[PDB]
CSV table of C-alpha atoms in Angstrom, one decimal:
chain,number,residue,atom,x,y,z
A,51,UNK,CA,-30.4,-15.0,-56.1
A,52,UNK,CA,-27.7,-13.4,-58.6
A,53,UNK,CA,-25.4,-16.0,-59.0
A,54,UNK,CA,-25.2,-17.5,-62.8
A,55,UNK,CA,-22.4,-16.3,-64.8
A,56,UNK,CA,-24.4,-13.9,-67.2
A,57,UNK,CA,-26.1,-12.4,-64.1
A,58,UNK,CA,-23.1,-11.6,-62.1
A,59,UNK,CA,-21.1,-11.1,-65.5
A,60,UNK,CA,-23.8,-8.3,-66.2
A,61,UNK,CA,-24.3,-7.2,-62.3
A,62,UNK,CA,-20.5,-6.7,-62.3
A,63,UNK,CA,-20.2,-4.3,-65.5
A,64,UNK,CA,-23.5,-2.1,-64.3
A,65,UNK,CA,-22.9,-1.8,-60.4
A,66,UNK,CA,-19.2,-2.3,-60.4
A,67,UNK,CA,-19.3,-5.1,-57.2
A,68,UNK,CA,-20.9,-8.6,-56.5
A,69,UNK,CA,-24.5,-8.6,-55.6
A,70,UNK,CA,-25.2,-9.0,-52.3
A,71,UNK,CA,-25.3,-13.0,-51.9
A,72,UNK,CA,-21.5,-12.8,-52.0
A,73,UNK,CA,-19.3,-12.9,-48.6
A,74,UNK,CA,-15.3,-13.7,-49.0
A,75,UNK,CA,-13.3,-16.8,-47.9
A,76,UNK,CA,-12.8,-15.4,-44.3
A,77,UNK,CA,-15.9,-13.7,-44.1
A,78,UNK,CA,-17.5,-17.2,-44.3
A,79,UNK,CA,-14.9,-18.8,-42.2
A,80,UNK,CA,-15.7,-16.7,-39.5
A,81,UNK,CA,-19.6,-17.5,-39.7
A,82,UNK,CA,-18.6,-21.3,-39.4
A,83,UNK,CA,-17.7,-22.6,-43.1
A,84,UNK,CA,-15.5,-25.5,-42.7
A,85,UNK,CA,-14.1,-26.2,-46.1
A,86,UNK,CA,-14.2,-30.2,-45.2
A,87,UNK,CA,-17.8,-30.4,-44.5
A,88,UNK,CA,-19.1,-29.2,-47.3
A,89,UNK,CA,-21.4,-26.9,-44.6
A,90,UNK,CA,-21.2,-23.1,-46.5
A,91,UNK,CA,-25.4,-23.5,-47.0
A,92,UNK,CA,-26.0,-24.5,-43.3
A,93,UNK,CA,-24.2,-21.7,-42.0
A,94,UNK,CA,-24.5,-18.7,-44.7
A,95,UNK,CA,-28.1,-19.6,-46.1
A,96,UNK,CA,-28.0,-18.4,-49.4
A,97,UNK,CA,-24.6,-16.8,-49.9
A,98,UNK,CA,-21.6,-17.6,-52.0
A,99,UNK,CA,-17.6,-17.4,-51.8
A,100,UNK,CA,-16.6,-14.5,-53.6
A,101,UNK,CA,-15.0,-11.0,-54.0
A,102,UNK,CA,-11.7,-12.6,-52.8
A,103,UNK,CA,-8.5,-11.5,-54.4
A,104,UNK,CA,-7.0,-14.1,-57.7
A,105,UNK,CA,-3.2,-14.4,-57.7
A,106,UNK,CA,-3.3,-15.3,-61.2
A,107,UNK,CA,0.6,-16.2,-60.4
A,108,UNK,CA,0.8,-18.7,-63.3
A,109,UNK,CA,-0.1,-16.0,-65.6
A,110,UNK,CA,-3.1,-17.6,-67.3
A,111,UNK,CA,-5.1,-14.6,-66.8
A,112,UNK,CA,-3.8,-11.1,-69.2
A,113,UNK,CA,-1.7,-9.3,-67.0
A,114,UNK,CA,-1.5,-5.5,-66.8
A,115,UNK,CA,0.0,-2.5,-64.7
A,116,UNK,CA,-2.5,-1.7,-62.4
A,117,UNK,CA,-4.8,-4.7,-62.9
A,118,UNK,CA,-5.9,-6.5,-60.0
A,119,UNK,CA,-8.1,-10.0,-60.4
A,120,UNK,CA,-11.0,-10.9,-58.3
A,121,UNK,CA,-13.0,-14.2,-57.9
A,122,UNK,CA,-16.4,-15.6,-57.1
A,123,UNK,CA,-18.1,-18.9,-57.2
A,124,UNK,CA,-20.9,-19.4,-59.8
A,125,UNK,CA,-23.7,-21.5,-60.1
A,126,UNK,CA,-23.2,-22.3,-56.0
A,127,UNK,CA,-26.1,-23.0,-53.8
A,128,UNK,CA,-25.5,-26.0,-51.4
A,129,UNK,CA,-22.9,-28.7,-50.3
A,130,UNK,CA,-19.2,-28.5,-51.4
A,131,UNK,CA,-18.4,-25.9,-53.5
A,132,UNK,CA,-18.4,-26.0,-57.3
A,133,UNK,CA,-15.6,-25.9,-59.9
A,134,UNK,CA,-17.2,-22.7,-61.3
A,135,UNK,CA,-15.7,-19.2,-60.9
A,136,UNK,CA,-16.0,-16.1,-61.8
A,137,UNK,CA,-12.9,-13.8,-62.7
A,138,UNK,CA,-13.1,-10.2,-63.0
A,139,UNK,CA,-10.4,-7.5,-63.4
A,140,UNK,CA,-10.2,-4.0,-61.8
A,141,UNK,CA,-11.1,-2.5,-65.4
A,142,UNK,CA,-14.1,-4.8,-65.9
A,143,UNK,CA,-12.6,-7.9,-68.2
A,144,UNK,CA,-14.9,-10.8,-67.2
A,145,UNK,CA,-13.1,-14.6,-67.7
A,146,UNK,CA,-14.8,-18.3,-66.5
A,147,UNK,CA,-13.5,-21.1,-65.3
A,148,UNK,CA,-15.4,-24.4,-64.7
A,149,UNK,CA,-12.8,-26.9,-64.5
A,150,UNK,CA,-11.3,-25.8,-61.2
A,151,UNK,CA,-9.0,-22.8,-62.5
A,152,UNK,CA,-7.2,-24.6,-65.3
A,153,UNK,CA,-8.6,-23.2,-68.1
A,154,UNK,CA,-10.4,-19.8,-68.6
A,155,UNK,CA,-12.3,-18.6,-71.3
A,156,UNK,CA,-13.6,-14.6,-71.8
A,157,UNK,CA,-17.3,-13.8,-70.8
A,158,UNK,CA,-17.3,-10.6,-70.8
């Protein structure tokens, strides 16, 4: 399962798309994930959140014409979800985040 930050950093600049462990917010919502119960593994065996659009609204992310932000949860494989994310643009810049989207730092 492809889901540390330097394998989906390096899946992500080589196939151009998460790996296939990743389902999005509603995808998983559908399937039964209940945010509250901490249930994603029960009811998605081995998948993570992610592919799911980042707003970046507050601007902490670069900004660009034409750049669109995407997220996915790293280091996930049971219980609640992590503070981990992935962030990747449209043109392939690769950022962290492991305190909960306050702080990012380039990967990639």
């Amino acid at each position: 399962v492809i889901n540390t930050f330097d394998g989906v950093a390096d899946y992500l600049q080589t196939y151009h798309k998460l790996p296939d462990n990743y389902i999005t917010k509603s995808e998983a919502q559908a399937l039964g994930w209940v945010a509250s119960k901490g249930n994603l593994a029960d009811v998605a065996p081995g998948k993570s959140i992610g592919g799911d659009i980042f707003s970046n609204r507050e601007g902490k992310l670069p900004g660009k014409s034409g750049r669109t932000w995407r997220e996915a949860d790293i280091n996930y494989t049971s219980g609640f979800r992590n503070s981990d994310r992935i962030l990747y643009s449209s043109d392939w810049l690769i950022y962290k985040t492991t305190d909960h989207y306050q702080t990012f730092t380039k990967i990639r």
